[PDB]
Design a protein around this ligand. Structure first.
Ligand SMILES: *[C@@H]1O[C@H](CO)[C@@H](O)[C@H](O)[C@H]1NC(C)=O
Lengths: 49, 44, 48
């Protein structure tokens, strides 16, 4: 969230491991960018339990 | 597909501007407004 | 004459001072006032 914008990058990959993040390389292509001008100090994930 | 949704703001209520990013598995939904919501979305 | 009236329009307000300088293109809608003194400020005719 910089210069009055908010950029999103995403990358999906399936794994067969349950231990930790994999020892691989992957770039993250841009997904979207919207102009929003509010400062952010905190954030929290949302779960549909 | 369990984890869906994000919130951002200073105090995260209706007194300050906040922007919300969510998903309900039919599309992508983003909201930016003075939204106050519970700490946990309860469905089902 | 477009935005001028004999009575006047008092809706236009400006912030004399705040806790810290507002960042460029950052909008703050809360009515918080700078805590200059140890006592709460609250914008009252108390301790400055
Ligand atoms: C998912 O979000 C879209 C956009 O708000 C809405 O049209 C759709 O009905 C939602 N799906 C639900 C509520 O099941």
């Amino acid at each position: 969230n910089i210069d009055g914008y908010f950029k999103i990058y995403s990358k999906h990959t399936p794994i067969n491991l349950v231990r930790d993040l994999p020892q691989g390389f992957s770039a993250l292509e841009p997904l979207v960018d919207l102009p929003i001008g509010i400062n952010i100090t905190r954030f929290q994930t949302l779960l549909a339990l | 597909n369990i984890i869906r949704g994000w919130i951002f703001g200073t105090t995260l209520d209706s007194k300050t501007q906040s922007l919300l990013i969510v998903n309900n598995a039919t599309n992508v939904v983003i909201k930016v407004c003075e939204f106050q919501f519970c700490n946990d979305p309860f469905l089902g | 004459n477009l935005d001028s009236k004999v009575g006047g329009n008092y809706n236009y307000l400006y912030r004399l001072f705040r806790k810290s300088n507002l960042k460029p293109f950052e909008r703050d809608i809360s009515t918080e006032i700078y805590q200059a003194g140890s006592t709460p400020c609250n914008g009252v005719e108390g301790f400055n």
